[PDB]
Design a protein that fits this description.
Chain C: It is found in: Cytoplasm. Chain C: One of its GO terms (cellular component) is cytosol. Chain C: Belongs to the eukaryotic ribosomal protein eL18 family. The structure is cut from a larger assembly and holds chains A (about 50 residues), B (about 200 residues) and C (about 190 residues). Chain A has about 50 residues and is mainly alpha-helical. In chain A, about 25% of the residues lie in helices and about 0% in strands. Chain A has two helices and no strands. Chain B is of the alpha+beta class and about 200 residues long. Chain B has helices spanning about 1-30, 55-60, 80-85, 100-105, 125-130, 140-145, 150-160, 190-200; strands at about 40-45, 70-75, 90-95, 110-115, 115-120, 160-165, 185-190. The longest helix of chain B is centred in the first third of the chain and has 28 residues, at about 1-30. With about 190 residues, chain C is α/β, with parallel strands linked by helices. Helices cover about 30% and strands about 15% of the residues of chain C. In chain C, the strands form two sheets. In chain C, strands 1, 2, 3, 4 and 5 form a five-stranded parallel β-sheet that branches. The chains are: A mainly alpha (about 50), B alpha+beta (about 200), C alpha/beta (about 190). Chains in contact: A-B, B-C. At the A-B interface, α2 of A face α1 and α4 of B. Chain C binds four RNA strands through α1, α2, β1, α3 and β2.
RNA sequence: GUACGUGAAAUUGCUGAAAGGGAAGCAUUGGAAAUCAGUCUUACCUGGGUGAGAUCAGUAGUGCGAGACUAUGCACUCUGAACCUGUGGUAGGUCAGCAUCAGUUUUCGGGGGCGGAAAAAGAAUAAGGGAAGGUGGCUUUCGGAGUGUUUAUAGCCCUUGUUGUAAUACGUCCACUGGGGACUGAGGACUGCGGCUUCGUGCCAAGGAUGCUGACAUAAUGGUUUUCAAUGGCCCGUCUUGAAACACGGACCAAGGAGUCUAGCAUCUAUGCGAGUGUUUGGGUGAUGAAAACCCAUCCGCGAAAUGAAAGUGAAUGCAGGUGGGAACGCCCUUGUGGCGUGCACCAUCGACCGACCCGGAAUGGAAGGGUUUGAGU
RNA sequence: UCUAGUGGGCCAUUUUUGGUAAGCAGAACUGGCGAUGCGGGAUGAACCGAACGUGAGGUUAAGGUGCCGGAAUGUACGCUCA
RNA sequence: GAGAAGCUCAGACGAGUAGGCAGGCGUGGAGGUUUGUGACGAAGCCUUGGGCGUGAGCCUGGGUCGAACAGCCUCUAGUG
RNA sequence: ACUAUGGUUGGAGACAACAUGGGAAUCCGGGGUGCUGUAGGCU
C-alpha cells in the first residue's frame, strides 16, 4: 500500500481523494461591488506626509 | 469533512476581512490599530551539524531541528521565544500564512505513526493518529496548526519535521548573519513564506 | 548530516534460545505461535523465559511451591503452578501436599514424591493444551541472586561482600584493612 | 637425455603487439584497435493437409453408500491418441522514434480576486494662489543686450469638484488556466482511498509504463585487454600532536616466519544430575585382539552452617515476619495512563534468630534481660 | 557482570598569568585535528562551508563568473596613476 | 509450501585510529556421508579467454602434466 | 557604563561600529524621620 507518493498540489485525483470540499471551493470572489470609499483621514494624511 | 473545511475557509476569510476593516477604520479615524501578535511560527534550521555549542544543540534537539533545511511549527510563547533567541544564529523563523501551511502539509506532509515517517496520502492515517482530538482530515490538521487550537501540541508532534530542499534561487550573499544585517538568520517575519516557497 | 544520538538502538533481549536442544526449539515454536495468536501476557512471558539462560532460570523446590500456594490470603487451592525451569526436591518437607506443577524438567525424587502424594507433573506443551492462555495459573520464578557469584558481586570498601579467597580462616584476608587493630577496617 | 618426476617467481634472449619531448606506475570517462557472449524465433499448446492406428466421452460386468485408480469388454469414429511438412500464428535479442501517463524537476507565459494614501502619479476638464521669466509686450538704434511688470501669441509649481469604484506598478492569493526541456518506470492476478457513470465484477491521470512503429542482427549493445585524451592521484610500514619528508626499515623473488601448551582464577554460555554431585587412585568382563568402549566398591574433593585469635558456641514469636514498588493471574468499571484481590523475581526498608564484642549479671555454668555495635551469616 | 585500549596530546575563538619577544611556557570555556574524507582559501592536520553506503536527477553552502577554470569582458554610482 | 534457521510489509540510519563483538573466505590432518572425481588423465603449474561474489575467494575454457583428489555435517591445529 | 551571542565587519594594531538580547553603579533632585505582637495600669 502506498508504493509511490503523489503530490495533491499537482495530481487532481489525489486532491479529490483528500479535501472533499475542494470540488465546491470557490476563489476570486468579488466584493468590490460597492462605492469603494477612500478611508484615508485628514489626520492620517497630515501625519503621513509631515516633514 | 467537507462541511468542516468550508467552515474553516469561511473563518479564514472572515478573520482576514475583519482585520482589513479594523485597519481602515483606524486610518479613517486617525488612530492606530495594533493587531494580535502571532501565536504560530515556522522555524527552519539553516546551520549544519558542525561546530554547535552544547546549549544550542540541546535546544535544536528539543525543537526537532536536527538536520539542515528542516522546518517545524511552534507555538510562540515566552519559553519558545527565549529558546529561539538562544538559537538565533542557527535558525530562521517567521509568521506562516495559510498557503505555506497547506502546501507544506500537502507536498511534504508526513505523520509519525508507530514511530515511523508515513506520508499523509489518506485521511485514514490522520484519523487513526489524532481521532481522539476530533482531527479527522488533513484540512482539520491544517486548521489546528494554523489557528493554534487546543490540540496544537499533539498535532505538531504528530507532524514529522518537514525535510525542505535547498532554496531555488539560493540564499542571500552571506547566509550566516542576521536577517536584519542582510543575511538569512534570525527572525524574518512574513519573509518566511517566500523562503518556504523557494525551499518547497 | 543528521545530529541523532544513538543510545537505545540495539535491543539487549534474546530472540532465540542459545541452546541447540531440538525439543526446546519445538517448545519455542509452539509458544511463538501462542504468543502471536493470543492476547495473553502469560504466553509472552513463557516465550521470553524459554530463551533465558541457565543462570536466568534458577531452580525451584516443591517446598517453595507449596509455601507460595498455601498462603493464608492466597486462594491458590487447586491452581496449576508453572515454572520455566527445573523443579527440585526438598527432603526437609517430610510430607508433600497435592500439587499440580508444570515445568521444563523435574528431579526424579521431586517427581516421584509429587506423584506419590497424589499430585500431577506436566510439561509445557501439556500446560499449553490444558490452559492455552494461562488462566488460573500461578507463574513462579526461582531466586536469581541465590547463586555464588552474587555474594562477590559489588565487592568494595564498606560494601560487605564476600572476597575471592583461596582458603578460609586466619592468615587469609583477615588483617590490615579488615580490623581496627591492624591499621583500619575496610 | 643422466645439467634427467612436474617445473613457479625474481632475472634473461628471440619473435609479435603497443607506447615513449627531464620518471613510471594508478583511478573515473570515453575514443581507436583486438577479443568474447548470444542458437533467441527454443519448449507446452493449437490453426491447416494427408496418411495410418490395437481407439475416446457416457457406460456394462469384475469392495455395502460418495469418490480415485488398475484391469476386462461395449461404445467403431465431426470425437480422444502417436507421427511428418510448411521459411504456419503468438515471430524473439540490440538500437531508436513518437504518443498517452505516473514521480521528480527546470524554464517561458496568460486570466482573475484582494490590499496600500480602497497606491502615489498622470490625462482631460472649473474655480483659484505665487514668482522665475517664454519674455508676448516695453525699451540703447536701423541687430542686438539687457530690462522690469505676472500670461499676453508661450508655458511651469501648489490647492481643492466630478468623470472615478480611473488605470498602472508593487505585494499577496486562486483546490484558475496554457506551453518547452531533462532524469526516473521501482512493484508484478485481485482486494484500498477517490472521481465519472448507461449503475456493470463498467470507465478513469485513483495503492509505481504502457501503446504504436521502424532499422539491424560477421550490425548494435554489453564484457575484457592495450593505448590515447581530459581531470584527479606524493612511498609503503612505524614511533609520533604532527611524515612525502633532509626521521627509521625496505635492491628483487621463492619457501619459512611470531598470543601457543600447561597449573590456576574470574565472568558469561551450553550439557547432565540436583541437596546432592564427581565411573577413570583402583578392580572386572579380558583370552580371544581390547591404550577404546562397558561395568563395579570403599575413601575422599566441593556443597548442604556460620562466627571467633582461641577455648567454644551455633540460626522459626508469627504464613519462615511487616512496609513500598513490583511479573503473571483472577473479579468488576466501562475505556481508561481505570479500580479490587493476592501477590514470583529483584531492590530499598523496619524487625526476628546464630556467632563475636560491650554490658547489667539475677568453685563451676551463663540460664533469662539488653545494646549506640560487629560477621564474607539464618 | 566481565574485559580491552588509553593514562606523551595538539590547533582555533574568547578570558588570561609568566616572559623583551617568540612558530615560547602555563591555566579556563567551546569547537575541532588526533580518528575527518569532501567543496573553498593557488598549497596546507586545526581556518570557512559541510561530516562520507553504491548511483540518477535537481538545488545550494563557503567560495567565484577576462584566460588558465565551470560561470555576466553584467548593470548603477564614484575614487585611484603608483 | 518457500531450509518458521522460513515468508511478507514499513520506517529510520550508514566517517572512523587504539580497541571490542559478530558473520563469513582460505590451509594441513580426523570421524561420518556423496553406486563423489580420476591414467578416455588426479594434484600442481601457465594463460594475450569466460562467469560469480562488495570482499576474503570460488567455478570454468585452452596448454603442460602424470597418480592421486574433492563437495557437505562435525572434530582438530605447527592454519593465511 | 558594562555584558551573552554573530559576521570572510572596519582598523596594521590598540580598539570601534553594527545586529539579536540582558542591563548597573554613582551623582543630583523629590518625599519620609519608625512600625508592630502579648499582658496589664491611666481624667
Amino acid at each position: 500500500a502506498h508504493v509511490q507518493k503523489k503530490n495533491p498540489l499537482k495530481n487532481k485525483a489525489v486532491l479529490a481523494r483528500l479535501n472533499p470540499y475542494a470540488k465546491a471551493y470557490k476563489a476570486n470572489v468579488k466584493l468590490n461591488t460597492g462605492k469603494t470609499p477612500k478611508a484615508a483621514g485628514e489626520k492620517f494624511l497630515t501625519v503621513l506626509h509631515e516633514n | 469533512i467537507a462541511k468542516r473545511a468550508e467552515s474553516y475557509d469561511a473563518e479564514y476569510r472572515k478573520a482576514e476581512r475583519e482585520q482589513i476593516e479594523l485597519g481602515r477604520k483606524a486610518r479613517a479615524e486617525g488612530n492606530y490599530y495594533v493587531p494580535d501578535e502571532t501565536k504560530l511560527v515556522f522555524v527552519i534550521r539553516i546551520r549544519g551539524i558542525n561546530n554547535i555549542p552544547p546549549k544550542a544543540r540541546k535546544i535544536m534537539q528539543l525543537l526537532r531541528l536536527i538536520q539542515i533545511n528542516n522546518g517545524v511549527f511552534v507555538k510562540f510563547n515566552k519559553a519558545t521565544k527565549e529558546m529561539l533567541q538562544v538559537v538565533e544564529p542557527y535558525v530562521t523563523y517567521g509568521i506562516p500564512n495559510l498557503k505555506t501551511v497547506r502546501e507544506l502539509l500537502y507536498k511534504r506532509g508526513f505523520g509519525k505513526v508507530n514511530k515511523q515517517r508515513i506520508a499523509l496520502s489518506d485521511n485514514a492515517i490522520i484519523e487513526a493518529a489524532l481521532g481522539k482530538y476530533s482531527i479527522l482530515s488533513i484540512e482539520d490538521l491544517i486548521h489546528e496548526i494554523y489557528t493554534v487550537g487546543p490540540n496544537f501540541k499533539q498535532a505538531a508532534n504528530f507532524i514529522w519535521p518537514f525535510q525542505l530542499s535547498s532554496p531555488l534561487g539560493g540564499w542571500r550573499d552571506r547566509k550566516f548573519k542576521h536577517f536584519i544585517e542582510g543575511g538569512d538568520a534570525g527572525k524574518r517575519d512574513e519573509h518566511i513564506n517566500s523562503l518556504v516557497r523557494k525551499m518547497l | 548530516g543528521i545530529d541523532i544520538e544513538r543510545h537505545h538502538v540495539r535491543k539487549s533481549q534474546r530472540s532465540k534460545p542459545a541452546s541447540e536442544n531440538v525439543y526446546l526449539k519445538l517448545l519455542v515454536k509452539l509458544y511463538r505461535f501462542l504468543a502471536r495468536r493470543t492476547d495473553s501476557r502469560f504466553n509472552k512471558a513463557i516465550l521470553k523465559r524459554l530463551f533465558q539462560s541457565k543462570t536466568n532460570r534458577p531452580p525451584i523446590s516443591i517446598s517453595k511451591i507449596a509455601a507460595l500456594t498455601s498462603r493464608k490470603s492466597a486462594s491458590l487451592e487447586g491452581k496449576t503452578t508453572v515454572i520455566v525451569g527445573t523443579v527440585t526436591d526438598d527432603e526437609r518437607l517430610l510430607t508433600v501436599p497435592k500439587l499440580s506443577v508444570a515445568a521444563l524438567r523435574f528431579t526424579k525424587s521431586a517427581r516421584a514424591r509429587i506423584l506419590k502424594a497424589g499430585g500431577e507433573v506436566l510439561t509445557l506443551d501439556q500446560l499449553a493444551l490444558r490452559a492455552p492462555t494461562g488462566s488460573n495459573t500461578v507463574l513462579l520464578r526461582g531466586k536469581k541472586h541465590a547463586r555464588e557469584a552474587y555474594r562477590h558481586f559489588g565487592f568494595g570498601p564498606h560494601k560487605h561482600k564476600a572476597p575471592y579467597v583461596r582458603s578460609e580462616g586466619r592468615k587469609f584476608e583477615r588483617a590490615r584493612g579488615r580490623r581496627k587493630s591492624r591499621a583500619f577496617k575496610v
